[PDB]
């Protein structure tokens, strides 16, 4: 739900998001 180098958890619809 922001920037990272680990994705947020399984998700669809929008672009893949990241955290920590």
Distances (CA, A) of 15 to 3, 11, 19, 20: 12, 9, 14, 17
Q: Contact, 3 vs 17, CB < 8 A?
A: no
Which two structure tokens, joined as six digits, stand for 16? 């893949």
Reading phi first (left if > 0) and then psi (alpha if -120 to 50, else beta), residue 13 is in left
How many angstroms from the chain centroid is the CA of residue 14?
Answer: 10
What is the experimental method? NMR
Strands (E), the chain: 6-7, 18-19
Q: How far apart are CA 18 and CA 2, in angstroms?
A: 5
Q: How far apart are CA 20 and CA 13, in angstroms?
A: 22
Q: How far apart are CA 20 and CA 7, in angstroms?
A: 9
Kindly state the DSSP code that residue 7 receives in the 8-state scheme: E
Which two structure tokens, joined as six digits, stand for 15? 């672009």
Q: How far apart are CA 4 and CA 15, in angstroms?
A: 14
């Amino acid at each position: 739900g922001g920037r990272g180098h680990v994705p947020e958890y399984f998700v669809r619809g929008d672009l893949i998001s990241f955290y920590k």
